[model samples]
Target: STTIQYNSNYADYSISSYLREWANNFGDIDQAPAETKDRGSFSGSSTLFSGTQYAIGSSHSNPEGMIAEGDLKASFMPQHTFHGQIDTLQFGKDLATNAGGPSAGKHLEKIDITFNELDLSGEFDSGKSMTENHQGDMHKSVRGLMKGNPDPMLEVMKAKGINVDTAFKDLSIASQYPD
Candidate 1:
């Protein structure tokens, strides 16, 4: 039997930071990259901590099944939430054959598995809301600024090409019904 211990203290900072960066960098829904194009599918890799290596493959066939273009580093974070998809599922019938010493007799009889189509489209909130807010507020701020009434935040948005009225409307609506 294999004893697996779960650590609750493990903080998936890398995954969280990646998500935040993805949100901030490509917040524009229109400009966001396609899932298959930008973030390609993944494949299982060896790890010291876990017994099983994680693998991700597209359901549709591709010439290259498990090829990573850039340098690949295994972090516990991506395996948890970012596994692209699983095409095959099986249990190790020869667990004992691979083990060494007296523990070699111990074998894994059964395993539970799940596969998913890794679509990141729903991972983050649509930037439409943010864009609307920026537009609304910037428009209002510009009018106020033109009238010799400048709001600091609005001024900033105006500088960034956001409309004050649009930004204001967005902010007002957000205040009433938060998303």
Candidate 2:
């Protein structure tokens, strides 16, 4: 019985009926050319990132007037799930009081997305997922098969043309590609 649930408590409003309104924004709940498979009964959801391209996650809220004083806690579990995005929100000022690095008031705070199966296919010649920072550094040099202890990170800085002294010289970095 998935109907794109969006349960919330915003006074004078009911979570029960609330979903139906935005549900309509997705498309008809009925069947026909009038009804759409677009974002309806089986379309599970996710936040697909932002700052460029579709920029869906660049904003603090969705539409024009949905913003409120508190959480907009929306959900799209449907009866199923999948991925990809043209763009997409549920958020606001009071609800956005999160201090998550530079990720604050932004997409990385709650992508909620992109996809579970697809690595980042945009942004670079072939972009990295951006979440490999499971430990940020000292990660597996060869796909968890071998972990290397790199120097204090100056090797990278030195190669990039940032000046360094003898203590920072001859620091060899490891290969990151996995076989």
| lDDT of every model, 2 decimals | 0.25, 0.22
Backbone clashes for every candidate come to: 20, 0
The alpha-carbon deviation from the true structure for residue 9 of candidate 1, after best TM-score superposition, in angstroms, is: 40
How much lDDT does candidate 2 score? Answer: 0.22
Worst 10 residues of 2 by lDDT: 140-149
Tens-place lDDT digits, model 2, residues 1-179:
10111212222223222323333332221232322221211111133222222111112122311111111121223311112221222321122322543233322232111111111121211133434422221111111111111232224323434333311112122111121
For model 2 the local lDDT of residue 22 reads 31
Candidate 1 local lDDT, residue 145: 24
Top candidate, metric TM-score: 2
Cα RMSD, each candidate: 21.6, 21.7
Local accuracy of candidate 1 as per-residue lDDT tens digits, 40-145: 2222224322222222222222211121111222223322222121222211112222245322223223221111221111111233343343243322322222
